[PDB]
Structures are given as structure tokens and as C-alpha cells.
Coordinates of C-alpha atoms in Angstrom, one line a residue:
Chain D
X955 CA 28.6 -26.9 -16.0
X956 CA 31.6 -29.3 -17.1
X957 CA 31.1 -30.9 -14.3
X958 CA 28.1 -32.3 -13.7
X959 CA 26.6 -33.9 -17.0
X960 CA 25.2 -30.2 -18.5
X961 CA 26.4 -30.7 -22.2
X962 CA 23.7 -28.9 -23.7
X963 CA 24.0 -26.0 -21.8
X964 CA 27.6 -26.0 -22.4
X965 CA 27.2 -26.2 -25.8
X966 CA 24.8 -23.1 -25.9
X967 CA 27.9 -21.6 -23.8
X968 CA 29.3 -22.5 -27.3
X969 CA 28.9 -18.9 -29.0
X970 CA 27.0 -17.3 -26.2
X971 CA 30.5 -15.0 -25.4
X972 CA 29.6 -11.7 -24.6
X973 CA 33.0 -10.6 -23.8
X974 CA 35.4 -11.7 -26.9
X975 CA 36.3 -14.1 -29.9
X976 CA 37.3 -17.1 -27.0
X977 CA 37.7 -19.1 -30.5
X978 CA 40.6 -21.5 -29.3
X979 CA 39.4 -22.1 -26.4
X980 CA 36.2 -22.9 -27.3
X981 CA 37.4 -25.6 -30.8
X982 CA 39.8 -26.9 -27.5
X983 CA 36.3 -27.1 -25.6
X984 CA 34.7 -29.0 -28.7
X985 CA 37.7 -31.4 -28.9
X986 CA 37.8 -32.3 -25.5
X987 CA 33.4 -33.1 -25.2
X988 CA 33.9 -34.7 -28.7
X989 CA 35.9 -37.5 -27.1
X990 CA 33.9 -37.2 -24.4
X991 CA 30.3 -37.8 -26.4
X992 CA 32.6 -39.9 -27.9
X993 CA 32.9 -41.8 -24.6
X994 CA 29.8 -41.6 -23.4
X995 CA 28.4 -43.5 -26.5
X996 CA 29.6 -46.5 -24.7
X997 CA 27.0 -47.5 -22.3
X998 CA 24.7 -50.4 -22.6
X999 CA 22.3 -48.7 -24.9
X1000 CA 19.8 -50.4 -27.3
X1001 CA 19.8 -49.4 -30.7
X1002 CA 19.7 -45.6 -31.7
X1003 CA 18.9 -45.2 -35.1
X1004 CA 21.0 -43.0 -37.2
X1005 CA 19.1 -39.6 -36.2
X1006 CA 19.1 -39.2 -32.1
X1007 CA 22.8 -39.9 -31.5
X1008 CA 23.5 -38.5 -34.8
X1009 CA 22.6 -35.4 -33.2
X1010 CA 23.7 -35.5 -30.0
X1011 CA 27.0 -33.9 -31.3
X1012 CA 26.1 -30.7 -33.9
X1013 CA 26.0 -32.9 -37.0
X1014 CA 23.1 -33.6 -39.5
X1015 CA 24.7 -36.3 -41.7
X1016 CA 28.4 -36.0 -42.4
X1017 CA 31.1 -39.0 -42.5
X1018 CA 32.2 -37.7 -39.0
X1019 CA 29.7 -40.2 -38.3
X1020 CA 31.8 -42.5 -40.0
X1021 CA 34.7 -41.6 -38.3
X1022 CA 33.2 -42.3 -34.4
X1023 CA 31.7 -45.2 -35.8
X1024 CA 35.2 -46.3 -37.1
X1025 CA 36.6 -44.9 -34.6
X1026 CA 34.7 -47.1 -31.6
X1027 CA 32.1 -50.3 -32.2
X1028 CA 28.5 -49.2 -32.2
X1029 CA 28.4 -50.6 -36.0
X1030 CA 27.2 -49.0 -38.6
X1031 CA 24.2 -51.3 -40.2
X1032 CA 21.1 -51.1 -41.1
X1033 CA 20.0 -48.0 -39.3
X1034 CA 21.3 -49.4 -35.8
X1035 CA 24.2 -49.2 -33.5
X1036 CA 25.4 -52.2 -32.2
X1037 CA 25.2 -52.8 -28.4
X1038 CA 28.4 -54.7 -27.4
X1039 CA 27.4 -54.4 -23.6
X1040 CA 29.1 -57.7 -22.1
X1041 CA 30.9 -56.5 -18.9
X1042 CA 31.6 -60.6 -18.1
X1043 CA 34.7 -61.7 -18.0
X1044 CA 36.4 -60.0 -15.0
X1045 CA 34.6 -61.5 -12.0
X1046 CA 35.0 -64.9 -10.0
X1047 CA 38.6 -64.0 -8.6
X1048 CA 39.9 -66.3 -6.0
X1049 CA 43.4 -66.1 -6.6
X1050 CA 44.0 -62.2 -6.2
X1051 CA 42.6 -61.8 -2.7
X1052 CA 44.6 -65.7 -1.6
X1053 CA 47.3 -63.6 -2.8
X1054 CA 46.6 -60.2 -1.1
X1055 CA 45.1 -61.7 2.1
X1056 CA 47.8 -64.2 2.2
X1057 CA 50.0 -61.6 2.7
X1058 CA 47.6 -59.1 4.7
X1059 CA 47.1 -62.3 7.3
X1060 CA 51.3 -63.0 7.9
X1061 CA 51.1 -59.1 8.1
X1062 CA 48.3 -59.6 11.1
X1063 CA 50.7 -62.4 12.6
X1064 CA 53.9 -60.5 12.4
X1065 CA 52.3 -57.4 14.8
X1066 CA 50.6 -60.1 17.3
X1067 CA 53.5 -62.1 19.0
X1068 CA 56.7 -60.8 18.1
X1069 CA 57.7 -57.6 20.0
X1070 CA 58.6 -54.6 18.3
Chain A
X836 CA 71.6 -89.5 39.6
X837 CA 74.5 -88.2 41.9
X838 CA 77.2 -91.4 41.1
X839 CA 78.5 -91.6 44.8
X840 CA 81.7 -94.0 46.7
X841 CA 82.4 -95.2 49.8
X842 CA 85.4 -93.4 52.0
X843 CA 87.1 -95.3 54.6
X844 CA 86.0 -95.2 57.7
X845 CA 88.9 -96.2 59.0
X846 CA 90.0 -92.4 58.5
X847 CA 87.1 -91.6 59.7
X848 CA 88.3 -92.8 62.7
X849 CA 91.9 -91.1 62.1
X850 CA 89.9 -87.8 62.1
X851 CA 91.7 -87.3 58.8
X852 CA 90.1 -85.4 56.2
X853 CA 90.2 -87.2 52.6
X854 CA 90.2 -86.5 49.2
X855 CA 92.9 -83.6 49.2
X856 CA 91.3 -80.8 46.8
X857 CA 93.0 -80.1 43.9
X858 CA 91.1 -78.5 41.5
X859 CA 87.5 -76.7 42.2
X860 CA 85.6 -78.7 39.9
X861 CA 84.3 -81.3 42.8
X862 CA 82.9 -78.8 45.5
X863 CA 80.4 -77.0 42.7
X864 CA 77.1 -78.8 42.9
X865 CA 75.7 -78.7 47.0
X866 CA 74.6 -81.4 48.5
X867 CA 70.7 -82.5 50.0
X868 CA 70.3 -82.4 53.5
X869 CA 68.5 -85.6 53.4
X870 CA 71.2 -87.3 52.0
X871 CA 73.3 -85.0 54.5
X872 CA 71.2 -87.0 57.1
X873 CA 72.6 -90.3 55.6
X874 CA 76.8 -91.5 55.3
X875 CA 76.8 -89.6 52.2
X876 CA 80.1 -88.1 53.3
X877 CA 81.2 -89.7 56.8
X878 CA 80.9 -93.1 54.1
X879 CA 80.9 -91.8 51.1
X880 CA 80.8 -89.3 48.1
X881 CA 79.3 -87.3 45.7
X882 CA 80.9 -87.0 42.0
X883 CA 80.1 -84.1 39.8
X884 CA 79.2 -85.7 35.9
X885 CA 78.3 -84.8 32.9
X886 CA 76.8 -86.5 29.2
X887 CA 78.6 -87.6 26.1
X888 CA 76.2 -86.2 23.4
X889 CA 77.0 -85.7 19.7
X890 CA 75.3 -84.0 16.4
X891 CA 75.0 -87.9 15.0
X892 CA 72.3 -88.5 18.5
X893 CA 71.1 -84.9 18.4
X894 CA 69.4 -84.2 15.0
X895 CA 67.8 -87.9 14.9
X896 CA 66.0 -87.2 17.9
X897 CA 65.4 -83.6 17.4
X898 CA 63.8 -84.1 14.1
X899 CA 61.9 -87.3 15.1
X900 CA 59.3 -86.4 18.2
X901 CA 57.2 -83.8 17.4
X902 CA 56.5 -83.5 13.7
X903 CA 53.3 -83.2 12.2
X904 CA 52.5 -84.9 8.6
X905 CA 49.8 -83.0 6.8
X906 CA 47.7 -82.0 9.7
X907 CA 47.8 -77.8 9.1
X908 CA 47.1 -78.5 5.8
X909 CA 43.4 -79.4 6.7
X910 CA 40.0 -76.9 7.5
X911 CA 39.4 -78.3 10.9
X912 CA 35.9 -79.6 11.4
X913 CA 34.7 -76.9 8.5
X914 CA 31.4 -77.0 10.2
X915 CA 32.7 -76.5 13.9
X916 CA 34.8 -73.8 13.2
X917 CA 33.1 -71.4 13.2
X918 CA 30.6 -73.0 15.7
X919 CA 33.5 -72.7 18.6
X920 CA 34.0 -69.3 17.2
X921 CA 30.5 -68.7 19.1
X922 CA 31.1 -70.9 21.8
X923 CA 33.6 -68.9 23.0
X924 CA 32.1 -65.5 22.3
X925 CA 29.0 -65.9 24.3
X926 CA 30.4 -66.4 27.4
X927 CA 33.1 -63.8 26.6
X928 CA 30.2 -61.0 26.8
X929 CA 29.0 -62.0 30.1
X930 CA 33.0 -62.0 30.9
X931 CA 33.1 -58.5 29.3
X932 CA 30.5 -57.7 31.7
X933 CA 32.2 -58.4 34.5
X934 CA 34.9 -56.4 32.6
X935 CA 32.0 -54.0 33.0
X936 CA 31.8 -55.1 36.8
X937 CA 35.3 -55.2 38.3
X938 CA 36.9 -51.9 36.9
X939 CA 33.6 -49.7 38.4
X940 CA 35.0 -50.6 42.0
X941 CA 38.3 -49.2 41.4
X942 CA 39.5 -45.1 42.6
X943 CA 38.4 -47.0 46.1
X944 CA 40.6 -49.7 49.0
X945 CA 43.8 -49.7 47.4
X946 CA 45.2 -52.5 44.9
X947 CA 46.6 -54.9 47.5
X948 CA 43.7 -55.5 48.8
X949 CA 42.4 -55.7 45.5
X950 CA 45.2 -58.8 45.2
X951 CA 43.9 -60.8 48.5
X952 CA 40.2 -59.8 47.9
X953 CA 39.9 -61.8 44.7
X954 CA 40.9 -65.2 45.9
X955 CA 37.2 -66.3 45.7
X956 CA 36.0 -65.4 42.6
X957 CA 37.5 -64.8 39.0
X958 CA 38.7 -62.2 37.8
X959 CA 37.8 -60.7 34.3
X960 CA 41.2 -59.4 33.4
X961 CA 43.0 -62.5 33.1
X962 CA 40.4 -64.6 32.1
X963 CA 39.3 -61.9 29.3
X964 CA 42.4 -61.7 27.7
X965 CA 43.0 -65.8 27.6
X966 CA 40.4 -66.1 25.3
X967 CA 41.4 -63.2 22.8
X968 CA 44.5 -65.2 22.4
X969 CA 42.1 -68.4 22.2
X970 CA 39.9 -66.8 19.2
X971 CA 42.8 -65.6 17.5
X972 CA 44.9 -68.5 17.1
X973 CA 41.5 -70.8 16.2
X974 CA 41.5 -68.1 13.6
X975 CA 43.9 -67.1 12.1
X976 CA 45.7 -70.4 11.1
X977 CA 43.0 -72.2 9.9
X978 CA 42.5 -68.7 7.8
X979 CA 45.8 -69.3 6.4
X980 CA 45.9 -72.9 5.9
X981 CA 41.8 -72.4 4.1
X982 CA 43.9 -69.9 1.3
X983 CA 46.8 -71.7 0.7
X984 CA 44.9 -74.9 -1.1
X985 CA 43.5 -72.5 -3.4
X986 CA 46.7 -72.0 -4.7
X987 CA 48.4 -75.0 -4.4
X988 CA 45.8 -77.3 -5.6
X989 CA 44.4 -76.0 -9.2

């Protein structure tokens, strides 16, 4: 269930042990989905008001809140999170394949006429 | 060229045989029997020569015929490029058919006749790989030369 995108589930994994305690392994489990929500906060969304991604997690209003919203952009303000979704600047690259192909096409020449 | 002199004939009519051999440096290079129809000998003979050459005459005419100026640093009729790069290609399907012809007719008269036979008509083998060499050097160097200027000018 780890995965494919089944959090929830996972989460209801998340003291649904039959068989022991599984304590560490499960606050290692929440760690490693926390930066993981964490992660996956930064999509191009539009605005989520401070309720539906302030519960994707487990929390109902804590500063851990605070400390994501610190922690990455997605501002806090005025009930909003702030949708930074640019993805520009890396396109329009010329250069990098008259480097690459400049070599790639001497490579194509060298295995053509001379004998080997 | 073959700087030749006359020899007496005078010991011609002696009988005597002239020139008295020395060194084999003179009896190297053979001579024509056209001019061994002519007095080349019985009046006259050959001389073995050579050329007086030095580095001050053979890089100013070595670096001086052929040179180009700024000619593979063009695109080559951008247009017509890659309109010869069909022009060739049609007719090299129909040639890849008669690759598709001339193989079918082999495991049959053996290959020598195979080698007289085709003195009428062409053969695809030869003529099929002439114009891979053909499309890949109208290819490849105007590839080359289209990605350098992209570098080299902004």
C-alpha cells in the first residue's frame, strides 16, 4: 500500500496491529509519509483553505501547521495557500544538445571510415 | 622527359660498345620500344634524372591549391537539403527492390556467370551502396557545420 498512492489506508494500518506494539516502526512510518505529505503538498494546487489540507495529515489545528508552512512556501495568509506553480525557466535549450550531439555526430563519423 | 645524347656512330661502325658501366645507377629505368624503334641507342642515349625540390617550394604550394575560405561554415541551400535528401531516397527504393530482385536468383548458375551475365544491366549491389555513402556525407557535415554556429555565434 506504500506503493501506490494508498495513504489513507496506510494510515488506518496505523494502529490496526493485531500482532504487537510495532511502535517504532510505525512513528518511523509517520516520519517518513510526513515528508512525504509534506512533498506532495507541492503540486500546482489552487488555494486549500486552512481545513482540507490541514487534515490530510492527523492534525486539527496545531503550529505543526506552522512548521510545514515554514517549512515549504504554500503561505500562510488569509485562509489560503499560496500556489507558486511556475515550472518556466528550464526549457528552450539549444546549447546542451550542440554540445551532446556535437559530440554523438564525431562519435557517428569516427565508426564510418576509419577501420577498427 | 627522358634527357637523351647522341653516341658516335663512328663506333657504331667500330662495333664497339660505349659508355663503359660503372656504377648501376644508368641501366634502372627500361626503355620504350617505340623509341627502341628509333636511334635512341645506335645514336643516342637515355639519362636517368631526378628534381631539386626543397621545404621553401613545398609548403607554398602545398598550402596554396586547395583551400577553402568559409565554405563548410555555411547550411547549403537550407531549403534543398533536405529536398536532395528525397531525391535520392526515391529512387533508392525502387533500387532496394531490385535488391529485392537480384538476391532471389541466387542458390542457382554459379557466381561467374553471375559476373558475365550482368554486363547489360545494373546491378543493385554496387549501385545500392554508392548512395548510402552519398546520403551520409550530404548529411552528416552539413549536421555538423548547422550545430557549430550555435555556439560560436551568440
Amino acid at each position: 500500500y506504500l506503493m501506490e498512492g494508498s495513504y489513507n489506508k496506510v494510515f488506518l494500518a496505523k494502529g490496526n496491529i493485531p500482532a504487537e506494539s510495532y511502535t517504532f516502526f510505525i512513528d518511523i512510518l509517520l516520519d517518513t509519509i510526513r515528508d512525504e505529505i509534506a512533498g506532495c503538498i507541492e503540486k500546482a494546487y489552487e488555494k486549500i483553505l486552512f481545513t482540507e489540507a490541514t487534515r490530510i495529515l492527523f492534525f486539527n489545528t496545531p503550529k505543526k501547521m506552522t512548521d510545514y508552512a515554514k517549512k515549504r512556501g504554500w503561505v500562510l495568509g488569509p485562509n489560503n495557500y499560496y500556489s507558486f506553480a511556475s515550472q518556466q525557466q528550464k526549457p528552450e535549450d539549444t546549447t546542451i544538445p550542440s554540445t551532446e550531439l556535437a559530440k554523438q555526430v564525431i562519435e557517428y563519423a569516427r565508426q564510418l571510415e576509419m577501420i577498427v | 622527359i627522358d634527357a637523351f645524347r647522341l653516341i658516335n656512330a663512328n663506333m657504331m661502325v667500330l662495333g664497339h660498345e660505349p659508355r663503359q658501366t660503372t656504377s648501376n645507377l644508368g641501366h634502372l629505368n627500361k626503355p620504350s620500344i617505340q623509341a627502341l624503334i628509333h636511334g635512341l641507342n645506335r645514336h643516342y642515349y637515355s639519362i636517368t634524372i631526378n628534381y631539386r625540390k626543397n621545404e621553401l617550394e613545398q609548403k607554398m604550394l602545398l598550402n596554396l591549391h586547395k583551400k577553402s575560405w568559409m565554405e563548410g561554415l555555411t547550411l547549403q541551400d537550407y531549403s534543398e537539403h533536405c529536398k536532395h535528401n528525397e531525391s535520392v531516397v526515391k529512387e533508392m527504393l525502387e533500387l532496394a527492390k531490385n535488391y529485392n530482385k537480384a538476391v532471389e536468383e541466387e542458390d542457382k548458375m554459379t557466381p561467374e556467370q553471375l559476373a558475365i551475365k550482368n554486363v547489360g544491366k545494373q546491378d543493385p549491389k554496387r549501385h545500392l551502396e554508392e548512395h548510402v555513402d552519398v546520403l551520409m556525407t550530404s548529411n552528416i557535415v552539413q549536421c555538423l557545420a548547422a550545430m557549430l554556429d550555435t555556439v560560436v555565434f551568440k
